[PDB]
Hints:
The complex is a heterotetramer, with two copies of chain A and two copies of chain C. Chain A is an alpha/beta fold. Chain A contains 16 helices and twelve strands. Helices cover 43% and strands 17% of the residues of chain A. In chain A, the strands form three sheets. Chain A has a six-stranded mixed β-sheet with strand order 1-2-12-7-8-11, with helices on both faces. In chain A, helix 11 (231-237) links the parallel strand 7 (222-226) and strand 8. Chain A starts with 16 loop residues before the first helix and ends in a 6-residue tail after the last helix. Chain C is an alpha/beta fold. Chain C has one domain. Chain C has helices spanning 3-6, 24-36, 56-67, 72-83, 97-101, 105-114, 135-143, 157-166, 179-190, 203-210, 221-228, 233-242, and strands at 12-18, 41-45, 91-95, 118-121, 146-147, 150-152, 171-174, 194-199, 215-218. Chain C is globular, with a radius of gyration of 17 Å. The two termini of chain C are 27 Å apart. At the A-B interface, strand 1, helix 5, helix 7, helix 14 and helix 16 of A face strand 1, helix 5, helix 7, helix 14 and helix 16 of B. A molecule of 2 linked components (GLC-FRU) is lined by residues 258, 261, 269-271, 283-286, 291 of chain B. Chains A, B: Its EC number is 4.2.1.20. Chains A, B: Pathway: Amino-acid biosynthesis; L-tryptophan biosynthesis; L-tryptophan from chorismate: step 5/5.
Amino acid sequence: FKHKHPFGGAFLPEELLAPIQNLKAEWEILKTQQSFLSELDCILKNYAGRQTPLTEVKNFARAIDGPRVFLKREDLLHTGAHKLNNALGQCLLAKYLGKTRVVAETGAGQHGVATATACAYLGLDCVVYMGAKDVERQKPNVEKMRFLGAEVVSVTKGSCGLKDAVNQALQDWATTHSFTHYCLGSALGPLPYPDIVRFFQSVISAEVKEQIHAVAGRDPDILIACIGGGSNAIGFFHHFIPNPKVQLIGVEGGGLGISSGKHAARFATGRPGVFHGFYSYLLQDDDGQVLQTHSISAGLDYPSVGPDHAEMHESGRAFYTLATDEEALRAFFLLTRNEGIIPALESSHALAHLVSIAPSLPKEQIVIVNLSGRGDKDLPQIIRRNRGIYE
Amino acid sequence: FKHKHPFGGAFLPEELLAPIQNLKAEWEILKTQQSFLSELDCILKNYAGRQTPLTEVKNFARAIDGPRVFLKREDLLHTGAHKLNNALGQCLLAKYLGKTRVVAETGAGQHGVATATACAYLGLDCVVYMGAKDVERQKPNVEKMRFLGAEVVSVTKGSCGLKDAVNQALQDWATTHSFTHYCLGSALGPLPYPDIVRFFQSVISAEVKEQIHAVAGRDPDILIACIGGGSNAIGFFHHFIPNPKVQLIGVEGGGLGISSGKHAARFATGRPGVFHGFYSYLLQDDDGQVLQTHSISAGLDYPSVGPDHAEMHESGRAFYTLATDEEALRAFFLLTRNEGIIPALESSHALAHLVSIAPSLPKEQIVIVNLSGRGDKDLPQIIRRNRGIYE
Amino acid sequence: SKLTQVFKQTKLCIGYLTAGDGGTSYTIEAAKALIQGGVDILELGFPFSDPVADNPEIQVSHDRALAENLTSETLLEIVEGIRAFNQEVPLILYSYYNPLLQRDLDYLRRLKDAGINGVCVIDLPAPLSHGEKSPFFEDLLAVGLDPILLISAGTTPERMSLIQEYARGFLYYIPCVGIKEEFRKVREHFDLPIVDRRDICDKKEAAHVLNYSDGFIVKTAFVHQTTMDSSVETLTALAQTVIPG
Amino acid sequence: SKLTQVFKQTKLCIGYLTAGDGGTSYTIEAAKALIQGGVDILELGFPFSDPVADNPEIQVSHDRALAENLTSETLLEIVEGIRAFNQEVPLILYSYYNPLLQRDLDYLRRLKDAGINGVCVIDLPAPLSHGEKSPFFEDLLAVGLDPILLISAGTTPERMSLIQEYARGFLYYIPCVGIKEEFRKVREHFDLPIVDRRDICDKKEAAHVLNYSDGFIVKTAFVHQTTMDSSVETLTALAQTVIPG
Ligand SMILES: OC[C@H]1O[C@@](CO)(O[C@H]2O[C@H](CO)[C@@H](O)[C@H](O)[C@H]2O)[C@@H](O)[C@@H]1O
Ligand SMILES: OC[C@H]1O[C@@](CO)(O[C@H]2O[C@H](CO)[C@@H](O)[C@H](O)[C@H]2O)[C@@H](O)[C@@H]1O
Ligand SMILES: OC[C@H]1O[C@@](CO)(O[C@H]2O[C@H](CO)[C@@H](O)[C@H](O)[C@H]2O)[C@@H](O)[C@@H]1O
Ligand SMILES: OC[C@H]1O[C@@](CO)(O[C@H]2O[C@H](CO)[C@@H](O)[C@H](O)[C@H]2O)[C@@H](O)[C@@H]1O
C-alpha cells in the first residue's frame, strides 16, 4: 500500500504538542504501574460490575438458523455500555497524574454521561462541552450529566454543533492541561489516545478468553463487533488478534446502503486522510472535505474510524463490513423477542451481520458477538418507527 | 398480640383452592431438587449477571457525615432491578412443572417487564393483564413487553384499572392453571407465594454475606431496604435474620407524611386485614375498606405488605419506618452526584433513611443499603419536578 | 331455620343486590321490587373495595356503593328497612372476609337481630385440617347465623368433613352432562339443598338449572338493570320474566 | 524569495481571507480591497470542513465557502484572479493538511505557478525525530514554496533543529513582558522574520505588537466585516484604520 504516513500519528497544532507529549510520557510509566492497575481492577469489579457474563443465546441462534452463539454482555456494565471501561481508566489516569479536572465534548451525550459518571465516583471536576443545537436535542442526557455533577457548557459560538464543542474543548485543554485531563471517548485521536483507549477496553477480550474456554474449551471461530470509532471492537478483538483461527468481523453503520450515499461505512467507500489529529480511513470527497454521514444509530454516525482498524483492514487481518438501518432494526427485534435482551442499535449492527451469515455457518462453529450496550435508550426512537413484527 | 389468624394464609375463593394446593405440593418437591437449583444458578450467573457487586460509597458517606457505607448493587442486574431474580425463578418453576404459559398482571409495568423478560429467555408464552387506564399511562412499558413477546391484554372491563386486571388474571389462572403458571411479583399473596418469592430473593443476602466478610471480616451492623410489597427487603434480610447483632430496617413510602394521609406506610397507620388472599398489615378504614395510597415512587404505592414483614414488625426483630417523597428525592440527587449511581426512587427511600440517621452512627459502623434498582426509569418524572441542587 | 323453611318449597330464585348502590333508600326500594317480583331469597352484597372474586359489573357496583358511603352501620339500616317490609324472605349477607373480620362478635348479633339469616364469605374457605377450627364460622354458629359455603367437584374429602361441620341452610355448588346425578351425591352427602352458583339471566337457563339444582341465582341481571333504568318497577318486571312458570 | 523581499521593509500587516467565502469573484474583490487598504501579505484560507484549530468566526466562514462550492480548482482561479491584479504582494496559503494531502505534487506546482508563495499547514507539525523527514515539507521545498511554520516558547530543541530545516520566508510565533528579548533570541536562532501570530483587530495593539514582532496578522476582523457589510470598500477602510501610521 502507498501511504505517506503510518496510520495514527499526531497531526496537531502547536498549542497541543506539549500537552500530548506530556500525556504520552506520563502514560508510558502508568500503564505498567501495579498500584494503578490494581486499583483500576478493583473499581471495575466493585463499582462497574466486571466481569460481565458471556450469555449463550440458544433461542436467538435457533430463530436465525445459526450455530453456537454467545453474547459478551457489556450491556450489563454500569451505565449500560462498554464506554465506562475507558471513562474510568482515563479518569483514574487523570487522578494519578494529579489532575483535578476532566474535560470532554459530546454529541449525543453517551460519552458525556460515561465521563461524568466516572468523575462523580472518583471525585473529579468534570466539564462537558456540547453544541447548543445538541443540548436542545438531548435534554434528557444534559439533565443526567448535570445530576451527575458535570458542568455542561452549551456552546453557542459558531454553528452551535459538535464541531464547535470540539474546538471549545481542545481550547480548554490547551489552557488547562497542567491540571485538566482531556477524556477521549473512542479509539480515535492523536497518539497516545488510540493506545490508551485500546488498553482500557482490552479487559473485554481477556474476560471472553477465560469465559469461552470455560464453557467450550477452545477459542471461538468468529468475533463480531460494531464499529463507531472502534473502541469496543478493538478491546473485544485484542487478545484473540494473534490467533489466526479466530476471524474478526467489524460491522459499520450502513444507513440506507452504499448506493444512497447515506451511511457511515468508512471502509466501504472512504480512504485514508488526516482528521482530528490522526490518519485513518475517512469519508471524504475528492478535495478531502469530510462527508456528511447517516446511521439509524447515533453511536455509529461518524466519518472517522480508529487507526488500529485501518491497519487491520489493509493487512487483511479483519473483515470490515456493514449493516443497513433496517437490518439493524430487524436484528434488534429478533434478539429482544427471543432472549429478552434489549440491545443497543449500535450492537444491533453486529447482530445483523450474524443474522445474514448464520445459515451458512456450520452448526459446530462458535460465534461471539460483543453486545456493546443495552437499548433502552433507543426505545423512544424505535417505537416511533411503528414497525410490525419481524421474523 | 391478639390475632384470629397467623399472618399469611390462603384466603381464596373455591376456584383457586385446587390451583394453589397443586402449586404448594409441587413447590415442596422442587425447592430441594438439585437439578432445578443448579440450572437456576447457571441462568442467574450467565444471563442475569449475578453476582452483583457490593460497592463502598465513600463520597456519599462523607457527604452525609456517615460511617462505612456499602450498596448491594441490584441495579446492575439484567433489567435493572431485583424483580428478575423472582421472575426467572418462577418462570423456571413453570417450565419444570410442565407449564407452557405464564400469566401475570401489572400496574406500572415493572413486574410485567421482568416476567416478560424471563419468559422470552425461557421460551414460555407470556400473558400480562393490564387495566386500560394503565395501558394509556404506560405506553413505553407496554411497547417493551410486546417487543419482549408478551401478550399485553388491555382490560377495558369494569373500571379499567389494576383491580380489574387482577380479576382478569386470576380468572385466567383458574381456567388455565393445568398449563399456566401465575407469576406474582412480590412477597404477597396466598401461600405458597410469600415463601416462593422469598426463596428466590434470598440469593441477595447469601451474596452480601460472602462479600461483606471479604472486605470487612464481619457481618454488617445495619441493613436498610425499601418496602413496596417486601420482596427485595426479605431476600436482602434473609441470611442475617438469625444474627441479633445485625439491625434490620425496612423503609416504606411516606409520601406527603403521615399527617396528610397521602402515604403508603402500612406499619405507620395500618393494621392487620385480609386482602388478595392473605392476612397482613393493611391501610384500611374503620369498616375494613382498603385506603387509597400515595408515593412519589409507584413501586412503593401499595396498601398491602408481605406477611413475613408483619411477623417481624410484631416480633420486634426489624424496624419499619418511612421516608417522605422529598427525603427520597434529596437522597436520589445525593447518591447520583457523589457516586455516579442513579438509584430508583424506590431504593431512594432506603437511602433517605440512612441520610437522616447517618450523623448519629459511630464512624466504625458498617451500613449496607440494598440498591434494589437503577433510576433511569425515574428521570422523566424527576426532571419534571424541576428541583434545584440538593445538599 | 328460616332458610330451611323456604327450601321446603322447591326451585327458589336468589336475587343479588349490592347494599348501598344508589344509597340506603334505593337499596331498600330495589329489595322490595325484587320481592314483589317473586324473588325468594335476597343475597345482599356488602360492597368491598377489592372484590377480586366478582365479575367487573359487580366490581363497579361495589365502587358505586362505597362512593355513596355505605358503612357497616347503614347496612344495618338497609336490612332493617327490608325487614320493615317483609319478615319472611331469607336474607343472605354476601361479603368479603375483611369487612366482617374488622367487626366483632357483637356486630354479628346486630346483623342477626336486623334480619340477616345467612352469611356467605367468598374468600374465607372452610379450614383444611380436620382439627383446625374457624373462628369466624364458629362465631356465626354461636349467634344463630347460617354459614353459606361453596363447594366444587374437586373439593377434597378433608373439606367435605369440615365443610359439613359449618354448613347450614344450603350449599352453593360450582360445577364443571349427567350433572343431575352429580348434584344428588352432593345433596345426599350433606342433606342440605344444593344450589348451582352459576349466573342466570334468562328464563330458559333458569328452568334448565332447576332440573338438578334446588334453586338458581340471578347475580348480574338485577344490578345491571339498575344501570340501564334505575326505576325499581323495571326490577319487579325483570324478575317476573326470569323466574320460570 | 518573494516573502524574503517583502520583509526587507519592516513591520508588515498580514490579512486573512477565506478563499471562496462569498464566491470566486467576491474573494478576488476582497483581496484587491485589502491590498489597496495597505495589507502587505495576504493569508488565503483553504476552507476545511473540520477546522478545529480555528476560532468559531473562521469555522463559520469555512462553512460558507464550502457551501458556495470552493474546490481545489476554483482556489486556483482565485489566486490567478488576485495575480491578475497584483504580482508583488506575497500570498500565503493557509490550510489544514488533508485538502493538500489528497492532492499531489503537481497540484503544488500549479499553486506556485498560480501565485502562491508560502504554505502554512496548521495541523502538520515539523517531524519530531532529528532523522525523520516530512514528505509534504520536502514536496513544498522541491517546487519552491516556502513552508510557513509555527513555534512556541516550549518548542523542544528537537523541533528547533527540524523546524529550522524546513522553515522558509518567516516564522509565526505564539507567545505566552520582556517579550522583545524573547523574540530576538528566536529571530537570531533562525535568521528569519518572526511574526506574532496573535489576532490583531485595532491599531493600538498592532503598534504594540510591532515593537518586537516583524509583523502582525489581522485574522478575524476582515472576515467578520464581510458579514457586517460585504461591500469591499469597507474592507479597504478597515485595513486603513487598523494598520498604524
Ligand atoms: O470558554 C471557556 C474558557 O474559559 C476557561 C478559562 O479561561 O475556562 C473557564 O470556563 C469554563 C467553561 O465554563 C469553566 O469550566 C472553567 O472552570 C473556567 O475556568 C478556558 O479553559 C476555556 O477555554
Ligand atoms: O465525493 C465522492 C467520494 O466520496 C466517497 C467517500 O469518500 O464515496 C461517497 O460518494 C459516493 C458517490 O456518491 C457514494 O457512492 C458513497 O456512498 C459515498 O460515501 C468516495 O468513494 C468518493 O470518491
Ligand atoms: O378474557 C380472556 C379469557 O379467555 C381465556 C380462555 O377462555 O383465555 C383466552 O384469552 C386470553 C386473553 O387474550 C389469551 O391469552 C388466551 O390465549 C386465550 O385462550 C381465559 O384464560 C381468560 O380468562
Ligand atoms: O380511616 C381511618 C383509618 O385509616 C388509617 C389507616 O388504616 O389511617 C389513615 O387515616 C388517618 C386519619 O386520617 C391518617 O392519619 C393516616 O395517615 C391514614 O393512613 C388508620 O390509622 C385509621 O383507623
